[PDB]
């Protein structure tokens, strides 16, 4: 309805260029493009589960049997698998229901897109995307951004772009912030 | 939580639209069934004390080894018997909560979530809970459509344990 | 995001005690008053666009500073945004009405709303005036009883006014 | 992503001095006593599940509030999370032991863990006591003198205890 | 760094698994090879002054235009000779650091990363350093598998430069 | 699978690099350990039948109820006894496979993957196999580092089931 | 990102008044001297590689601690990064020069760069000195009256210097 | 905003390259065509009041049926007449900015963006302004290149509204 | 992927019989000559760059059509791509040599490579010739009898040739 209100980007490791060979802190790249055997496909599926949902919350009920079968028969790209995790009801209960739009922009960007918010203005900038278009459409555009297509092509599991001397997003961001802890004792 | 009302609301929120007549029809059906649902919940909770103890004895009879051979996973000690009472009480309380909520939401959030993960770590055989829930499904003391609702939730738990 | 049934169940789960007889009768009362709730949401949703538009027409004239050059509602784009946000608040309030609690209003909205506008540079006081004008519009349209079997739905009107007030106080 | 070797090499690179004879003989000692280290880590990883499970039973017996209804280790989902956190701490400590350096432990696990626990409300003090229980259990099982070629490795056991203590203090 | 121990740790960390016997066997292999690796490192470091000067002269002899052609990217001036000696010394020093670390970690972090950018901006043709490393590879003064290890790291640097 | 050889190769493949000395040293350690690993595998397979039978009797002694309680999940029937022997034989065969492979690869690809689903659906209590593998760990009849390796893989299976 | 013309139209839109004669003649003066602006940016960008390389040699000559082992741009990796950041600042200031306003420079280059360098350990003061070195280089190369139709362009060079100065002040 | 200069800058920034001669040629073209556009802007600002008055009467005559119906979205009342004058002035005020910016940037930033939702909610028919601006389009008093460039922007806006 | 050990284990698991004594003896023979495999891989990988460069110069001298204008290996961009793919094939072959099995080579490099070149329009026959040039160069460098402990490594050299041949036959 509205061209998303422009945000001012801040300097970040992901934005910067660097001529580095992979370190031991390299995020590790789970690519289904090679069409590896089923056993390695299990690792790739697990990494996507580990990214969209946190390692903490990926239990049996969280596991979608259909998704497990999806990424096994060289089906919809790993990107679409990520989107399926994102729009699944368990994700909406675990993340969307427990945070406000402004925090949701940050969480989804850190996990799905894999880069931190450029600034508070960007958190505001995409909050309306969540509101007007709907959360499903917000994650749709989040993984359909030109940035995403360059970052992880199609068959590459999302990873933190470059946490060079930086805390990993999973270990700095909880499932929900203390603001919702008002509903807890 | 997976409550009928909230499920309709979330479905409308996905499409960013005011609540359409489809969702309103769904919640109307929930309200129409709520009379039988709440009466069933009352019946189960006011008979809860007998039910919990009966289920404990039922599992003790079906699996005598769970009462005799030593181990923390078993109720060989009075402390273990207390643990057994506590957990079967959890299941009964969750079923009443699901009955009043009108959906599987409560038991999915407070019980079924990660149930498999922990029942293997603490070595609590799911079959024990299966038999206990079967006893509760046989002695619930409900009748008619109230009974069908309660038994549906009980069997949801049974299938989840398996 | 909870509903009435889920709210009482959540408190009961925190306590760890089977639903008390008192809670049962409370929820029975909630079911007794279900039809009126459904009627109200149906009526408000059928006229939603007209409600918000009519209130907006008056709002911009009664607060001219916003539409004068240099004000926050000036330019076509920001005017579009103000209309959009008015409709957003109306939508989440309708959600709340059907739910029976203000949980949804405070969870995915109204959690830091004031801070967002304050950083954007929008005057929060003017937003509060807009929310209150919307509140009057909504209470009026729901409380114009005709075409249906009458009842004392004043309770529904009061709780709707409470939702709108909660939003207005949260943004200012 | 450092170990003992990388730590000393990084100091030497910061100074810009060719590796001194003293540094060479200081790391040859580490390699000569490496088989003991490997045995210790093998023993702790072989009993990981039992260690965490027994420690968890003890924690819930000493602090029943966690497993009572309304406590943070209730609803069987949070119980799974608690067990997972305990084993995560053990896992990062095991990494630290095999490396011989605390770099990995401070780079991934202990880099601000306090903030996450503080925000969620998970009691950090209880986590600390749980880590200490795991510490005594693991050190005892690894130092069990029967079943292995005998030797004197109290220093390595003290280092293992130091890693556990570092985590327990940093999170609490 | 990419040290073998830490590389195994990171490999296990990505999957969230405790270090099984695979990682332990890898580290055991590192410790078994450490005897030869330390021998080679001591040999290179104790003779680290004759070889650096010899390599400087070797490059001057293979490429006589590098010390007479006018400019700033040459060793004609004494300051240029100092910088040239420092560069060949950096390569040798990094090789010894990699020998002690057991892995190519130090080389990658301090040398190989961004090598092309610097060699292109300051007009330092890789061939010069290639010849210097060949001289060091021929006069290192080692025997057996220790010599193999020295001639492996130096050749890695050679094949990384070019 | 997660065989040491393949693990190093994959680590170099994701980083688009030729196999450097780090990976070569790792696989060298694997080959040094392979002599003892092959010895251990030979030992286990030569007395496989005795181990299988003894483990079967061990679980029958630890769990008397599995030999009488009626139902398909129990081995009260001779057919069930045959199935129990077949399963513990599978576990032993995979232990020998892991010994030869020098890693947990075979175990993960043929046993651990989805182990929970099967042991829950057919109501096969994990404790049964836990006790069986404990017996195997006690009667393996190995000595030295070979015993260490076999014990480690058996315990990996035990902790995976737990 | 607002260039000169966009800046004046945006200010005029905020005031709500047709473009005033004074602003008209200001932008007309900019256009009359437009060829000079284009030639300046063409000279700076056509010698970009040499500019950065010469400035780098000067920086390492004046501050040898940088290229000394265990310094701040030592190792090929950090050396490449320092060269990269010098070139990046040059690129965004050339953008700013062509635009005629500093909006791009402060929005996409200097928007939090100071915090980045505070965390990294890179000296902000030294990078400011480097920016000044590039300022002198770019001003000298553009002020080569040999090879171009002559005229008085020092006035236009003063704002190029101003943009370099703005970056140098913003980076520390 | 979408200024030719700004668009070239953005195209170069997304590639990360210094300004090539292509972009410099484009900006040169902008400067070369900025003589006529600035003349046109000067002309239209100096006679702005008279032309807005004429356009206001033009729309009053073309739509007297809106000029007589009483309401908030009409100019029948004197307050509405004042509102109509200010909005006609707004369109002229934006067109001058468009002329100076040499692009459609101002059009999209101060209008066009969300024109549909505004013309749906307030239901202020764009045809009103369209007729007024066609009066302006003939009576602007420009000639030659100034006239044709201004006409291009005006008709872009007209066809964008529909 | 399956290495040699994994291949024998996988076949034995498919049939469902404990590994027989014959298989054990075979694997013992493999480990007895493992040092030779490691040495060969080390020697080939340390000369990768020279191998690919010499083979490339020879290929373009023998088939000038590739470097003629309008040919496939032209325009200096496709030349870079050609060298990159030649070294890619060499890299996956080295992986295969270290593994002792062709599974990795057949699962990543030559897997569906014929189709790739056929669509791109490159002559697959020429690719095969290039792989053969690399084969002779690499086998000569790896079988160089001067520099190391003498012995007969001919079996392993034939295996290396077999891998190169497999790639050459799968691309053309
Ligand atoms: C649209 C929903 C859907 C269906 C129906 C489906 C079928 C399906 N079953 C599969 C696997 C399989 N299916 C079987 C099935 C059987 N083996 C037997 O002995 C039985 C007779 C039979 C069970 C009744 C087996 C053994 C595999 C594993 C094959 C493999 O990956 O190696 C696979 C291969 C990849 C995977 O495991 O996901 C697919 C695609 N996949 C889907 O996404
Ligand atoms: C509200 C959701 C919820 C559930 C379901 C829950 C279950 C639960 N049951 C447990 C244990 C247990 N549960 C039992 C129960 C039984 N003993 C028997 O003989 C019977 C067969 C059976 C009753 C039917 C026993 C004995 C333990 C202790 C296990 C041990 O110490 O090893 C434990 C481990 C901690 C403990 O020992 O209490 C949990 C977390 N906790 C929860 O927060
Ligand atoms: C979670 C629910 C939710 C809310 C509340 C929300 C509000 C919201 N409104 C915004 C903009 C805006 N909001 C308004 C609203 C107003 N303009 C006025 O004149 C009045 C004072 C006021 C109405 C009474 C305006 C004008 C803008 C645009 C600001 C600008 O671009 O300068 C922005 C800025 C970022 C953007 O445009 O995307 C947000 C986040 N978005 C949401 O998803
Ligand atoms: C700078 C760019 C810009 C534009 C274009 C713009 C348009 C614009 N026109 C408006 C209203 C209006 N427009 C008219 C116009 C007319 N009535 C008639 O009978 C005529 C046929 C017609 C003149 C052609 C009237 C009467 C209103 C007031 C309606 C109201 O407040 O409800 C409003 C509502 C608030 C207000 O009154 O200002 C906006 C925002 N706003 C902007 O910031
Ligand atoms: C698909 C969603 C849905 C709607 C819209 C719905 C409406 C609905 N409203 C009803 C009645 C009614 N509605 C009211 C409500 C009101 N009393 C007042 O003073 C207010 C003006 C108004 C509140 C807005 C009353 C008093 C009745 C009749 C008695 C009753 O049913 O409780 C009835 C019962 C008799 C009838 O059909 O009229 C229905 C079915 N039911 C639905 O399932
Ligand atoms: C790899 C490093 C790492 C750490 C350390 C970590 C901690 C961590 N633990 C969490 C949850 C949790 N952690 C606990 C832990 C405990 N409950 C208790 O009663 C005990 C005192 C304690 C165990 C000893 C619980 C119960 C939750 C779930 C909280 C909830 O969802 O309500 C969460 C919430 C987000 C999520 O579930 O993913 C994080 C981030 N996460 C990480 O990625
Ligand atoms: C795959 C990695 C790996 C393992 C698992 C391994 C085991 C291993 N441990 C050994 C010795 C040993 N292990 C210990 C360890 C201990 N002393 C104590 O008092 C404690 C209870 C325990 C430490 C916690 C000692 C003292 C020796 C003999 C000396 C030595 O070589 O370290 C030895 C040599 C002598 C022998 O055959 O027993 C081997 C081969 N070697 C390896 O390369
Ligand atoms: C440890 C990682 C590391 C490396 C490798 C490194 C190399 C390096 N060598 C340099 C210069 C240089 N290196 C040489 C070296 C040579 N002159 C000759 O005649 C020979 C052929 C050759 C020696 C074999 C010269 C002449 C320069 C100066 C280039 C110039 O200023 O033009 C420079 C430019 C900055 C210097 O003083 O300002 C760098 C960065 N720096 C590093 O931090
Ligand atoms: C190769 C890897 C592999 C494993 C591990 C495996 C397990 C496995 N065990 C099974 C059954 C079984 N497993 C047992 C085993 C036992 N009964 C007892 O009393 C003991 C306590 C215990 C032995 C320690 C029994 C009796 C069945 C048949 C159960 C049934 O049909 O209900 C079945 C069902 C099919 C069948 O009846 O054979 C599977 C799939 N299958 C596999 O392919
Ligand atoms: C587009 C605007 C922009 C800028 C400017 C920027 C800066 C920037 N420079 C970086 C690297 C770096 N920057 C420097 C900087 C310097 N060291 C020195 O001695 C000098 C004084 C100085 C050169 C002027 C160094 C040494 C690194 C490497 C860090 C490392 O590898 O550890 C990094 C780290 C992450 C990465 O490399 O991706 C950032 C974010 N990022 C941006 O997006
Ligand atoms: C493709 C983009 C583009 C460029 C690069 C460009 C440059 C440019 N500079 C010019 C002249 C000129 N350039 C200068 C510039 C200078 N005076 C000095 O003292 C300094 C040494 C130097 C500043 C760089 C002067 C004074 C003139 C003559 C007057 C003028 O036209 O600006 C002219 C007109 C005469 C000619 O063709 O040379 C052009 C076209 N025009 C363009 O459209
Ligand atoms: C980092 C991993 C690693 C490597 C690389 C390594 C090399 C290595 N190769 C060796 C032997 C050897 N190397 C060869 C090699 C050859 N003979 C030929 O005629 C060919 C030209 C060539 C093979 C293509 C032979 C025949 C032996 C002796 C027997 C053997 O051990 O394989 C030896 C033992 C004798 C000695 O040199 O002291 C070592 C240590 N050891 C290691 O742990």
Describe the overall structure:
The structure is cut from a larger assembly and holds 1 copy of chain A (185 residues), 4 copies of chain B (162 residues) and 4 copies of chain C (172 residues). Chain A has 185 residues and is mainly alpha-helical. Chain A is 46% helix and 0% strand. Chain B has one domain: Phycocyanins (Globin-like), CATH 1.10.490.20. In chain B, 78% of the residues lie in helices and 0% in strands. The longest helix of chain B has 26 residues, at 21-46. Chain C is mainly α. Chain C has a single domain (1-172), classed as Phycocyanins (Globin-like), CATH 1.10.490. Chain C is built from 10 helices and no strands. Chain C has helices at residues 4-15, 21-32, 34-46, 48-62, 64-67, 76-99, 103-107, 113-120, 124-142, 154-171. At the G-H interface, helix 1, helix 2, helix 3 and helix 5 of G face helix 1, helix 2, helix 5 and helix 6 of H. The complex binds phycocyanobilin (CYC) (12 copies). One phycocyanobilin sits between chains D (66, 72-73, 78, 81-82, 85-86, 88, 109, 113, 116, 120, 122-123, 126-127, 130) and A (54-57, 170-171, 174-175). Chains B, E, F, H: Heterodimer of an alpha and a beta subunit, which further assembles into trimers. The trimers assemble into hexamers. Chains B, E, F, H: Its main location: membrane. Chains B, E, F, H: InterPro entries: Globin-like_sf, Phycobilisome_asu/bsu, Phycobilisome_asu/bsu_sf, Phycocyanin_a. Chains B, E, F, H: It is found in: Cellular thylakoid membrane. Chains B, E, F, H: This is C-phycocyanin alpha subunit.
What is the largest interface, and how many residues per chain? G-H, 34 and 38 residues
CATH overall fold name of chain C: Globin-like
Straight-line N-to-C gap of chain A: 41 Å
Helices and strands of chain C, in order, run as HHHHHHHHHH
Shape of chain A: globular
The molecules bound to the chains, other than polymers, are:
phycocyanobilin
- Class by helix and strand content of chain C? mainly alpha
Structural class of chain A: mainly alpha
Strand content of chain C: under 5%
The CATH H-level superfamily of chain C is Phycocyanins
Number of strands of chain A: 0
Secondary structure elements and their pairing?
The structure is cut from a larger assembly and holds 1 copy of chain A (185 residues), 4 copies of chain B (162 residues) and 4 copies of chain C (172 residues).
Chain A: H1 38-52, H2 65-70, H3 78-87, H4 89-96, H5 101-113, H6 120-133, H7 135-143, H8 146-152, H9 169-172
Helix pairs in contact in A: 1-3, 3-7, 5-6, 6-7
Chain B: H1 4-14, H2 21-46, H3 48-62, H4 65-68, H5 78-101, H6 105-112, H7 115-121, H8 126-139, H9 144-161
Chain C: H1 4-15, H2 21-32, H3 34-46, H4 48-62, H5 64-67, H6 76-99, H7 103-107, H8 113-120, H9 124-142, H10 154-171
Helix pairs in contact in C: 4-6, 4-9, 6-10, 9-10
The structure holds phycocyanobilin (12 copies).
PDB class: photosynthesis
Keywords: Phycobilisome, Phycocyanin rod, Light-harvesting, photosynthesis
Entry title: Phycocyanin rod structure of cyanobacterial phycobilisome
